[PDB]
Amino acid sequence: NEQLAKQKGCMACHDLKAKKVGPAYADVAKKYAGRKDAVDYLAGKIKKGGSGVWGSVPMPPQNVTDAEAKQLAQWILSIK
Amino acid sequence: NEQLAKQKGCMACHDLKAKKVGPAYADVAKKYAGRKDAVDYLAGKIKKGGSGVWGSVPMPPQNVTDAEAKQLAQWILSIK
Ligand code: HEC
Ligand code: HEC
């Protein structure tokens, strides 16, 4: 039960339910750290959408330019 | 950049950084849905700790009785 989980400190490292469907940007940055094709890969994902890397729920295609997609990819890749 | 990510709606489905190291309970429940040994498995994980199912950061052993471990497992398995 939930009150026992709280009183035991469990909720310091767990949530009940994921608050966001997509991966956290720092986790994306870590997965793709050290890869020369990461910006091109991600900029295309962000623009066209995709599924199956992190799970089965898809990212819909996003309303960004190629420029904006590239920049978002560069920014996410710097997150730490 | 971050302001473009916000203005594009990206933060509806992403965080910058994971807020918790461990999996969300609803995700645990889904992974283990439909398994007769799930309560025994999880009660042991919660009590003894573990790593490598969700990632490499370990769950330390937790200060719970066997009773409490079993109940926490039963509760997490009901989360949806
Ligand atoms: C607004 C322009 C953005 C930007 C910059 C990003 N997203 Fe998403 N995203 C969502 C889901 C469900 C996933 C996982 C897809 C899969 O499992 O393959 C993602 C993934 C990403 C990534 C990583 C891509 C990869 O192949 O590793 C990145 C860099 C990313 N997104 C950026 C879900 C959503 C949304 C839900 C409705 C929304 C809105 C966005 N994402 C928006 C954006
Ligand atoms: C307080 C008593 C609890 C309870 C009920 C649970 N946890 Fe944790 N947990 C943490 C990490 C990093 C993981 C992943 C471990 C790996 O990758 O194998 C987990 C995992 C779990 C599970 C799922 C276990 C499985 O094998 O699928 C469950 C049911 C669970 N925990 C319950 C991290 C932490 C903590 C960080 C310091 C703390 C505190 C807890 N967990 C506490 C608890």
Residue numbers in the entry:
A (entry chain A), B (entry chain A): 1 to 80
Authors' account:
Hydrogenobacter thermophilus (HT) cyt c552 is a thermostable c-type cytochrome. Its high thermostability is achieved by the dense packing of the side chains of hydrophobic amino acids. HT cyt c552 has been shown to form dimers by domain swapping, but the swapping region (N-terminal α-helix and heme) was different from that of horse cyt c12. In this study, we expressed thermostable HT cyt c552 in E. coli cells, and found that HT cyt c552 forms oligomers by domain swapping in E. coli cells.
To investigate formation of oligomers in E. coli, we freeze-thawed E. coli cells expressing wild-type (WT) HT cyt c552, and performed size exclusion chromatography for the extracted solution. Therefore, we attributed the peak at 50–75 ml to HT cyt c552 oligomers. However, no oligomers were detected in the chromatogram when HT cyt c552 and cyt c552 free E. coli lysate were freeze-thawed together, indicating that HT cyt c552 oligomers were formed in E. coli by non-covalent association of its monomers. There was one HT cyt c552 protomer in the asymmetric unit of the crystal, and a domain-swapped structure of dimeric HT cyt c552 was obtained at 1.8 Å resolution. The hinge loop was composed of Ala18, Lys19, and Lys20. The N-terminal α-helix from Asn1 to Lys17, together with the heme, was swapped between protomers in the dimer. The domain-swapped dimer of HT cyt c552 also exhibited high thermostability by maintaining the high density of the amino acid side chains as in the monomer, where the dimer did not dissociate to monomers at 70 °C12. When a holo protein is formed, it creates a transient oligomer with an apo protein. A heme is inserted to the apo protein of the transient holo-apo complex, refolding to a domain-swapped dimer. Our results reveal that more domain-swapped oligomers are formed for more stable proteins, and exceedingly stable proteins may have disadvantages by forming oligomer by-products in cells.
